[PDB]
């Protein structure tokens, strides 16, 4: 006898392709569960997102799912939500806290390890690596890159990170950094490990403009977007990883709405991302989108 409850989904931006997909799944899911949904867009600003989260309370949200712009800057706003006793969870990103709300999404640390293991297996006697990292204060970056670094370190000094730069998750930055640094290295690196697809796709454009062919420098990504899957299929990109946004979003909304409607526990969801190479593209959530 219950429908049209207001749920807010606070995203840090709607400019990056992963965030755009999270919004898509959320709107679809909202219709299936017969809830009202507002997807708030932080515009890559912590100040805006904090304000968005204040508005979520004023607007009478019955549940709030938050993907924080920043590990620390959003914490006060999340604390206000908790004090108001509004059912809440994080998704994708997190905030640093001693009593976190439930979280929905892939284990980024494990994902980072898994990407590193695949690189090491491709270069078992070592490699020179360019590492492109995400928005520094995003927990998705922090955890994923820690996994990558720790697992490369466990492989030993034969894995050498010769460039280590943030691209803030942006395609344009992957392009700029790779076009800028490749000419300055006395030896061609073996691998470019990108913390996401967007920067890896920009790296690929850079390599293409430098006159290189697919596979001359290995490139890894993360997010399993259709464009990235197309580049895995044609060999420009060695791997991506599926952190299963349809599962994360649908499960987060189902559990939050279940708490609203029936007082069911919000348990969260933790799982490893699935590494996607050329031989297993059909395991990606969005395989049907590859023309
Ligand atoms: O007021 C109509 C609303 O009904 C809800 O059950 C739907 O989930 C919304 O998508 C819609 O806007
Ligand atoms: O904002 C970022 C960005 O969209 C990355 O591409 C994605 O891998 C991260 O999970 C997300 O937090």
Strands 63-66 and 269-271: unpaired
Which residues lie with the beta carbon below 6 Å from any ligand 2 atom?
Answer: 16, 18-19, 92-93, 138, 140, 169, 196, 198, 222-223
CATH assignment of the domain containing 216: 3.40.50.2300
Residues 66, 115, single domain; the answer is: no
Residue 163 shares a structural domain with residue 173: yes
Between CA 235 and CA 156 the distance in angstroms is: 28
- 223 and 262 in a common domain: no
Resolution of the entry in angstroms = 1.8
* Method for structure elucidation: X-ray
For residues 88 and 200, membership in a common domain is answered with: no
Compute the distance between CA of residue 191 and CA of residue 127 in angstroms, rounded to an integer. 7
Q: How many domains does the chain have?
A: 2
Ligand 1 pocket member 203 (CB < 6 A):
no
Q: Same structural domain for residues 127 and 89?
A: no
**Are both 172 and 284 inside the same structural domain?**
yes
Q: Quick one: how far is CA 30 from the chain centroid?
A: 22
Give bridge partners of residue 270 from the DSSP assignment. 105
Question: d(Cα 267, Cα 256) in Å, to the nearest integer?
Answer: 9
Return the closest-CA partner of residue 38 out of 25, 54, 20, 26: 26
3-state class of 59 per DSSP? coil
Q: Do residue 193 and residue 65 come from a single domain?
A: no
One domain, residues 250 and 280: no
Residues 158, 214: one domain? yes
Discontinuities in the chain (C→N > 2.5 Å), after residue: none
Which domain range does residue 146 map to?
105-245+271-291
The residue nearest atom 12 of ligand 2, judged by CA position, is 140
Q: For residues 115 and 109, give the distance between their C-alpha atoms in angstroms, rounded to a whole number.
A: 10
């Amino acid at each position: 006898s219950m429908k049209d409850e207001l749920v807010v989904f606070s995203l840090p931006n709607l400019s990056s392709p992963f965030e755009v997909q999270l919004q898509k799944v959320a709107v679809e899911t909202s219709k299936k569960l017969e809830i009202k949904l507002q997807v708030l867009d932080g515009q890559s600003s912590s100040t805006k997102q904090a304000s968005d989260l204040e508005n979520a309370i004023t607007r009478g949200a019955k549940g709030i799912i938050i993907s924080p712009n920043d590990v620390n800057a959003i914490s006060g706003a999340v604390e206000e939500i908790i004090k108001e006793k509004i059912p809440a969870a994080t998704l994708d990103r997190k905030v640093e806290s001693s009593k976190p709300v439930p979280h929905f999404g892939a284990n980024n640390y494990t994902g980072g390890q898994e990407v590193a293991k695949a690189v090491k297996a491709k270069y078992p006697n070592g490699a020179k690596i360019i590492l492109l990292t995400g928005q520094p204060g995003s927990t998705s970056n922090i955890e994923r890159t820690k996994g990558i670094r720790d697992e490369l370190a466990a492989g030993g000094d034969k894995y050498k990170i010769v460039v280590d730069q943030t691209g803030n998750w942006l395609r344009s930055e992957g392009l700029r950094i790779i076009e800028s640094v490749l000419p300055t290295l006395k030896e061609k690196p073996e691998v470019i490990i990108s913390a996401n697809d967007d920067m890896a796709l920009g790296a690929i454009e850079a390599l293409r403009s430098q006159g290189l062919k697919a596979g001359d420098i290995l490139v890894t990504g993360f997010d399993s977007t259709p464009e990235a899957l197309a580049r895995v299929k044609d060999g420009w990109l060695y791997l991506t990883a599926d952190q299963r946004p349809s599962f994360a979003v649908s499960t987060a909304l189902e559990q939050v709405v279940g708490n609203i409607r029936e007082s069911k526990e919000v348990s969260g969801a933790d799982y490893p991302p699935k590494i996607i190479l050329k031989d297993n593209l059909q395991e990606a959530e969005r395989f049907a989108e590859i023309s």
